[PDB]
Amino acid sequence: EVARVRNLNRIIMGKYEIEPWYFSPYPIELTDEDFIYIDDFTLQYFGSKKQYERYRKKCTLRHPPGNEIYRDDYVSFFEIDGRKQRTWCRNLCLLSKLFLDHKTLYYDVDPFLFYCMTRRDELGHHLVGYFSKEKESADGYNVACILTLPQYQRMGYGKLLIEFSYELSKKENKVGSPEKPLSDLGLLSYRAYWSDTLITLLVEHQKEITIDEISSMTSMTTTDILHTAKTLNILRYYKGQHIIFLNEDILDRYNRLKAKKRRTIDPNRLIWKPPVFTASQL
Amino acid sequence: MDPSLVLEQTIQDVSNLPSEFRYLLEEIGSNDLKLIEEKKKYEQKESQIHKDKEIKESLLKCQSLQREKCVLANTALFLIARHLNKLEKNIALLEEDGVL
Amino acid sequence: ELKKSLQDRREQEDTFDNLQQEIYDKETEYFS
Amino acid sequence: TWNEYDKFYTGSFQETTSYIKFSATVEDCCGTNYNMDERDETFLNEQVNKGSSDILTEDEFEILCSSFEHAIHERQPFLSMDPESILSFEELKPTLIKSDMADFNLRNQLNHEINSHKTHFITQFDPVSQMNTRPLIQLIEKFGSKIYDYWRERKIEVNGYEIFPQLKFIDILNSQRLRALHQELKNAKDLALLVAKRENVSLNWINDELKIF
Q1: B95, C19, D4, D47 - which has most CB atoms within 10 Å?
Q2: Measured between alpha carbons, how far is D128 from A167 in angstroms, rounded to an integer?
Q3: Backbone dihedral angles phi then psi of residue A219, each to the nearest 5 degrees
Q4: Residue A14 contacts D where some CB pair is shorter than 8 Å
Q5: Radius of gyration of chain C (CA)
């Protein structure tokens, strides 16, 4: 009776409507108001109507303040530390739990990494992707729940976005997972992920190989490969986790990557260990 | 252990400053090269009136080449200054403490 | 007052360029 | 849609060749902590400028009443619901001879050693509207009493709240090295005094030729 309470109904930002879907611990008197406006870049909080053009003018830092790590012509890759930048990130995870029902903001939010996917602008950088992954070593779990604003979907951002999030995860190079229990619009996108990535990772045999030959560049375990082998209906290959081949593959959409498989982000980036491991005993 | 506490308060924000050593200096050098080549471009007017078609607007666009250098140094002052506030007061939080 | 006002351009190259060489003065105290 | 969104956007940023890493906690993401409603300038329109000649401007509001706004936090944890437990302007004077109301005093102390107070807090974070900004002690003796006595009845009537809604939730070898290495940000500031001298001999040349022509 708590996680299924919607209180907002409407947001208009720019030309773009936002419908809420889940419950976030916002004050309910601001759900009582009808306007839900915000800064486009820095996300400043208010409750009034005589402040718009003046916060718009005084915000000449028209970006997200994250540490930008990789900007090509298409993507621009930040990270944010929430111990370093707090209240912006308080509301940043408040929006994600307004669109997801498995998180509550009272216990600490400081340490864990805030990876980000923007388009660059000439005014600044428009936020078009993000997620709040861990600082380190939660449950395996090399990615987290990846959420962004819903009107920049379905045209070439979100799918390859979560795939290069995974690419950064095995380019921060450790075997993990997303969340375990539930998914509503992404579990099918998760098998679209693992099929497309598996076919691109192991159309490259030229011999017989164990599955640990390719599992090192997966960030998903060797044991996952048989359930990914039976997502695509039948690819029994004289089964055994210690060796595998591939058939002369049926090739539904292996060489059909002319759509939404068009860009590559290079592994040109450093490592992001915690400088203090931060054993918070208080 | 209070100095260890404040050391893990301070290393993550003294650490992004040699990254700013990578950042803020190349435009100082490039704008300085533009300033000296531009000064060679606008010497000839003061020479020929010394022995105005370009000189004043070229000094103005020299200023456009240098005000961004100055505001980069002024933001450098700002991000030196706030962390130096907490830095010197945390040196003071060590000194007033029984630790240091 | 007018001619010195036109030629302070002609006369403060020494100040602007010893500002240019203040970094040459400070490189080794940056090595502190 | 919006009709304010297109008139929202103007200006630009430094479109990087490769990378300008951004790093700003929320205290330096917007500017002033608060904005203004209809009443703070309805006071300006109807109870200030009926016959006055001296200017009461917007930058004087969001700094001068901000001094009381930030000062009742650092000075007053007494009642967070009070209409009237704040006392007067003249007893706020020790919190008004200095106004560390998000760092004005060390803002003066930095450009003490940069000796460029003519650059009265020049930044790209906040806009060009900065030469209008003059320091706050003369703002006290021009307007502080009246902005206090308009700003006082407002927190009488917002009675301990504010205008925004509520938001619920080994010693050794470790001091001399940070001294002798933040001497490098000290001499980075000496480079800043240096480049302040660069731009002020530049505008020496500018304003010298401007007091010619």
Answers
A1: C19
A2: 42
A3: 55, 35
A4: yes
A5: 15
Q: A176 and A220 in contact (C-beta within 8 Å)?
A: yes
- Report how far residue A246's alpha carbon sits from residue A55's, in angstroms, rounded to the nearest whole number: 59
Q: Which positions ≥6 away from B90 have C-beta within 8 Å?
A: B6, B9, B10
Which amino acid is it at D103?
D
With an 8 Å Cβ cutoff, are D194 and C19 in contact? yes
- B98/chain A closest Cα distance in angstroms: 22
The answer to whether A76 and A91 have CB atoms below 8 angstroms apart is: no
Q: How far apart are CA B29 and CA C13, in angstroms?
A: 19
What letter represents residue D80's amino acid? S
Question: Would you call A63 and D26 a contact, using CB atoms and an 8 Å cutoff?
Answer: no
Cβ distance B85 to D106 less than 8 Å, yes or no, reads yes
* Structure determined via: cryo-EM
Q: Do chains C and A touch (3 or more CB pairs under 8 A)?
A: no
A166, burial (CB in 10 Å: exposed 0-12, middle 13-18, buried 19+) = buried
Chains D and C touch (3+ CB pairs under 8 A): yes
Query: This structure's resolution (angstroms)?
Result: 4.3
For residue B32, the enclosing domain spans 1-100
- Residue D137's contacts (CB-CB under 8 Å, 6 or more residues apart) are D97
Q: How many domains does chain B have?
A: 1
Structure tokens given for B3: 């100095």
Query: Which own/partner contact pairs does B93-96 have at CB distance under 8 Å and 24+ positions apart?
Result: B93/B2, B93/B6, B94/B2, B94/B3, B94/B6, B94/D171, B94/D175
CB atoms C16 and D201 under 8 Å: yes
* Beta-carbon contacts of residue B59 (< 8 Å; ≥ 6 apart): B42, D205, D206, D209
> Which residues make Cβ contacts (< 8 Å) with residue A269, sequence separation at least 6?
A69, A70, A77, A168, A171
Q: Each residue of D49-58: b (16+ CB within 10 Å) or e?
A: eeeeeeebee
Rounded to whole angstroms, the Cα distance separating A175 from C7 reads 70
Q: Which residues of A are catalytic?
A: 179
D-chain residues within 8 Å CB-CB of C30? 184, 187
- What backbone phi and psi angles, to 5 degrees, belong to A18? -125, 120
